[PDB]
């Protein structure tokens, strides 16, 4: 998953 | 959550109230205890409680129930060089009439969604939602303009000649207003609908962009390789290598390698999303033939 | 009276209307330098395409070309070539058959590639006639080794696809011609414009397509070599 | 004003040499590459070979090339050529040609019908 | 073709070395000073207010 | 016979020089010496146009000083307004390469042409609501490179088959040819009073011919390369010439001699366009190395430079009344400057 989410 | 946690405990105090060697099985509704053990206090013969030697303490032993019982500053210094250069990138552009082609808008654009995203993140790093559904716009956004500008130079090759100015309008819709359709739904669903599918209705619509960029890449690369290869064999073959390693940046082909790791409170993710604006603002705007040549006859002019 | 400026105002709006309408068409349309010689069958191609100037238009997959012949005008065309730098492509035709006249072709072509205003337009080279080249090398008293002693140390290169049933001879003959071109076109020419030769000869139901795809690489070209990728 | 003064040519005996001399004038020589050309009798022009600016880039017509070697003297502002075996084919007059631009890798329509910056030219004949 | 030609060609330079010329030092004298009396009006040489410039 | 005849061409070729060496006392290096430098020009835009497809080729000024022609090469003459940078008429040509236009002093036609070999004129004040063409000008062999009016009917033409031609549009035939020129014929110059012009082709010379009776009263040569573009000094009685040789050479009608010569070590690139100013002191030349130099005509000093194009520099005008020089380039952007 992207990072921030 | 936290959150939750405390409202069984409370829920567990109301009914304490209601109600108002001794072992009790370690309480159900706190998660992290063990709930195969047990708590123990003492009964006095006189009916008290227990108490702790020279103290008002009540003894208690809760040793079963608790038998299971840098990185922010990396991904700050990095979004704020990438800021740094892409604030004088966009600017430096803007002020040149000679190079305001479509080829150059979209890269404007491109560079103005990394700072917006940069910042989103950088402020954020009903009142606090708006570093909470505002940056997940603002992080959607530059996936789907990652997208979109991958999208042009893949409209240009595989559309053969193709019309780059007569369909500009619809790639601005598709970039900063197309994550209005999921954000939007989303941010509905999570204020009014419900204030695992908690996360899948944003990231999904984001992973679509990564993926099909990822497919787009290799259409380019193998479009470039062959084209070179129909023109030295040996030295456009390291040619390919330069200018493939030059795309890398522009596509976000990185974002891939972890595309389905599942985490939450845990990276090469805030090592390469520090730089990716970094990149895109030396290479295709810093360090171009064209830009170079505009500053130095700029310079000369005055 | 200030009446009359918004009238002149108002009539900008109305001839700048036209002139967008004008940039789509100008920008749709490709432009092509067709040169060659009196006995090269330059005509003899424009047949074909049936879709002291000649403009030839032809209509290829909703994709409109101007191919341009210049006949009326002098030999000197120092001054007049300069006019054709905006074109997309030069279409340039040579009697492949003819050797006296060869080497002339070779200067000709020459002349384009290293002209300042030229250096930036890819070349299309077209080899007409080359059915009548292949006649005439079977007599073997016509031999390419008198107007070029290079010729006879020159074997077939291995990217080569002949016809089915063709003698080998002619193959080393019609790839030299070929080859001799290029040798000044990859000598002098780096990223900005490529030489795009080509066999054709009068039976061929052809080089509307061919041409297409050639003119499709060049624009495409364009816009990799705008973001350093060649 | 712009001349080309030609020199040399005439009667020699089939395979013998000939040296041609271009006195050039009314510009500076070093600035300009040069170029030969001859006409045959009933024919069209040839081009048959050219100098750069510094005079290092030679090439010929091909059919020509070993039997002819072309020089120029910067010094003295004069263009050489000397054959070494001349064959009955290379009957013609030998014009002494300039290029148009000062800073060139092209010239233009040199072996032109009516060009104007040609010499006069030298008829060489070969004959007993 | 050369004969027909060459008698016209030498005609045409014959009647033009006949020209009456005139010293090069009065050829030059005589621009230099139509050249400064009409210099004091161009507004080219003299930078010229933007008051009566049109092109502001 | 032609043995002797080109010995008296000898006789006579250097007989010519001999009369100018007799003439030449001295040169203008020496008699402008005592006279101050103008100094700097600081020449800036004023007024960018911006409308043309493609490369403009050429334009025009009228004797309003106002309305100014351009062609560029995609079929388009647009007539522009230099006081409101508007366009008054945009005229569709039938062939899309056109290298030349001309504004008529009474401003009722404008002419124009190019690789069609016709000087096509076009009637700006007609009844009906678009632009027609007034007279197809068909005959030449060769490409027309310039054409230029010297009243309402009559109109010179130069081309690439080496010959200049008058033409009378009420019947559309010309009435006198120009031939002399060995290479084609690429600029025009005609005088104040329109009684005499000067025509440069690529043959590095210049020759004036006369518009009643058609012969090259005199010859100049001078230049090593192609001629490429003449105005004639406001006197009307001497010209500056710029070639492909990077230099421009002042050329006396009465002297008939290079006065003086406009070389600087630095310039290497061809010279597109020259004209005066209405003084004459500065001769703006345009280059081809994407800027125009101006040239002390009398200092033989690099006075100013106007760099505003990416592109040549392809035709040059200065407005007659003097006001203000405009640069036409290959960008497609008339720069006008004051």
């Known amino acids: 998953s992207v990072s921030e989410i | 959550t936290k959150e939750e946690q405390i409202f069984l405990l409370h829920r567990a105090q109301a009914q304490c109230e209601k109600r108002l060697v001794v072992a009790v099985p370690c309480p159900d509704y706190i998660y992290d205890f063990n709930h195969k053990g047990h708590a123990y206090r003492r009964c006095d013969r006189n009916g008290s409680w227990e108490l702790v030697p020279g103290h008002n303490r009540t003894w208690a032993n809760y040793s079963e129930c608790v038998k299971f019982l840098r990185l922010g500053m990396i991904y700050t210094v990095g979004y704020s060089v990438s800021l740094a250069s892409l604030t004088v990138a966009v600017l430096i552009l803007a002020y040149f009439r000679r190079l305001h082609c479509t080829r150059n808008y979209i890269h404007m654009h491109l560079f103005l969604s990394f700072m917006l995203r940069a910042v989103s993140i950088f402020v954020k790093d009903a009142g606090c939602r708006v570093a909470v559904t505002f940056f997940l716009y603002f992080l959607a956004t530059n996936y789907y303009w990652i997208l979109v500008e991958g999208l042009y130079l893949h409209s240009l090759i595989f559309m053969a000649f193709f019309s780059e100015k007569k369909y500009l309008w619809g790639f601005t819709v598709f970039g900063w207003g197309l994550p209005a359709v999921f954000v939007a739904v989303w941010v509905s669903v999570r204020a009014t609908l419900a204030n695992g599918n908690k996360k899948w209705i944003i990231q999904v619509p984001i992973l679509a962009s990564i993926v099909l960029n990822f497919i787009l890449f290799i259409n380019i690369v193998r479009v470039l390789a062959t084209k070179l290869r129909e023109t030295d064999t040996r030295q456009q073959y390291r040619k390919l290598l330069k200018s493939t390693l030059v795309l890398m940046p522009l596509f976000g082909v990185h974002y891939i390698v972890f595309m389905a790791t599942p985490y939450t409170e845990v990276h090469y993710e805030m090592l390469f999303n520090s730089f990716q604006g970094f990149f895109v603002a030396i290479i295709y705007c810093f360090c171009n033939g064209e830009v170079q040549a505009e500053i130095k006859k700029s310079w000369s002019r005055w | ?230 | 004003q712009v001349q080309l003064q030609e020199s040399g040519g005439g009667l020699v005996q089939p395979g013998g040499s000939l040296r041609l001399s271009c006195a050039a004038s009314g510009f500076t020589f070093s600035n300009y590459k040069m170029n030969w050309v001859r006409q045959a009798p009933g024919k069209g022009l040839e081009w048959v070979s050219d100098i750069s600016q510094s005079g290092a880039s030679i090439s010929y017509t091909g059919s020509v090339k070993g039997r002819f070697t072309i020089s120029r003297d910067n010094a003295k502002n004069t263009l050489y050529l000397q054959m070494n075996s001349l064959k009955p084919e290379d009957t013609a007059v030998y014009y002494c040609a300039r290029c148009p631009a000062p800073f060139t890798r092209d010239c233009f329509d040199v072996t032109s019908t009516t060009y104007a910056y040609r010499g006069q030219g030298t008829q060489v004949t070969v004959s007993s | 073709a050369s004969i027909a030609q060459a008698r016209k060609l030498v005609e045409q330079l014959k009647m033009e070395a006949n020209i009456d010329r005139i010293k090069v030092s009065k050829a030059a004298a005589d621009l230099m000073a139509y050249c400064e009396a009409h210099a004091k009006e161009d507004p080219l040489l003299t930078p010229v207010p933007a008051s009566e410039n049109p092109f502001r | 016979e032609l043995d002797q005849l080109r010995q008296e061409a000898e006789q006579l070729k250097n007989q010519i020089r001999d009369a100018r060496k007799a003439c030449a006392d001295a040169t203008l290096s020496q008699i402008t010496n005592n006279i101050d430098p103008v100094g700097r020009i600081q020449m800036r835009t004023r007024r960018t146009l911006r409308g043309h497809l493609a490369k403009i080729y050429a334009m025009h000024w009228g004797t309003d000083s106002r309305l100014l022609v351009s062609a560029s090469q995609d079929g388009k003459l647009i007539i522009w307004d230099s006081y409101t940078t508007n366009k008054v008429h945009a005229i569709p040509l039938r062939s899309s390469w056109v290298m030349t236009c001309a504004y008529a002093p009474s401003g009722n036609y404008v002419a124009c042409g190019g690789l069609d070999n016709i000087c096509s004129i076009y009637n700006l004040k007609t009844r009906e609501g678009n632009v027609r063409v007034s007279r197809e000008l068909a005959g030449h062999t060769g490409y027309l490179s310039c054409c230029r009016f010297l009243d309402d009917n009559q109109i010179v033409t130069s081309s690439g088959d080496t010959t200049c031609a008058l033409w009378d549009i009420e019947t559309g035939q010309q009435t006198t040819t120009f031939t002399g020129h060995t290479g084609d014929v690429m600029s025009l110059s005609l005088a104040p009073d329109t009684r005499l012009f000067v025509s440069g082709a690529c043959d590095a010379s210049a020759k004036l011919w006369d518009v009643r009776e058609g012969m090259c009263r005199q010859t100049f040569t001078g230049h090593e390369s192609d001629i490429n573009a003449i105005c004639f000094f406001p006197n009307g009685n001497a010209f500056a010439t710029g070639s492909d040789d990077a230099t421009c050479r002042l050329f006396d009608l009465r002297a008939d001699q290079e006065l003086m010569t406009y070389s600087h070590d630095n310039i290497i690139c061809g010279i597109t366009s020259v004209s005066f100013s209405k003084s004459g002191r500065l001769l703006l030349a345009g280059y081809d190395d994407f800027n125009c130099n101006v040239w002390d005509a009398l200092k033989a000093d690099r006075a100013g430079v106007l760099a505003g194009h990416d592109n040549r520099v392809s035709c040059l005008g200065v407005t007659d009344d003097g006001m203000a020089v405009a640069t036409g380039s290959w960008d497609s952007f008339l720069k006008i400057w004051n």
């Open chain 3, 1 to 230: 009276q200030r009446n009359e400026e918004k009238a002149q105002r108002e009539a900008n709006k109305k001839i700048e209307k036209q002139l967008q309408k004008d940039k789509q068409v100008y920008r749709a349309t490709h432009r092509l330098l067709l040169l060659g010689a009196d006995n090269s069958g330059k005509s003899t191609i424009v047949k074909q395409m049936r879709i002291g100037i000649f403009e030839t238009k032809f209509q290829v997959d909703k994709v409109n070309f101007h191919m341009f012949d210049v006949g009326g005008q002098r030999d000197e065309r120092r001054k007049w070539i300069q006019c054709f730098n905006d074109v997309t492509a030069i279409i340039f035709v040579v009697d492949s058959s003819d050797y006296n006249r060869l080497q002339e072709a070779l200067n000709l072509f020459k002349s384009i590639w290293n002209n300042r205003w030229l250096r930036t337009i890819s070349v299309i080279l077209f080899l007409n006639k080359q059915d009548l080249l292949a006649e005439k090398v079977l007599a073997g008293k016509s031999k390419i080794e008198d107007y070029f002693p290079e010729f006879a140390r020159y074997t077939t290169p291995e990217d080569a696809t002949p016809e089915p049933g063709e003698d080998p001879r002619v193959t080393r003959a019609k790839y030299f011609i070929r080859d001799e071109f290029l040798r000044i076109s990859t000598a002098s020419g780096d990223g900005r414009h490529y030489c795009y030769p080509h066999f054709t000869c009068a039976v061929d139901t052809e080089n509307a397509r061919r041409i297409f795809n050639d003119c499709r690489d060049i624009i495409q070209r364009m816009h990799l070599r705008q973001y350093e990728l060649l």
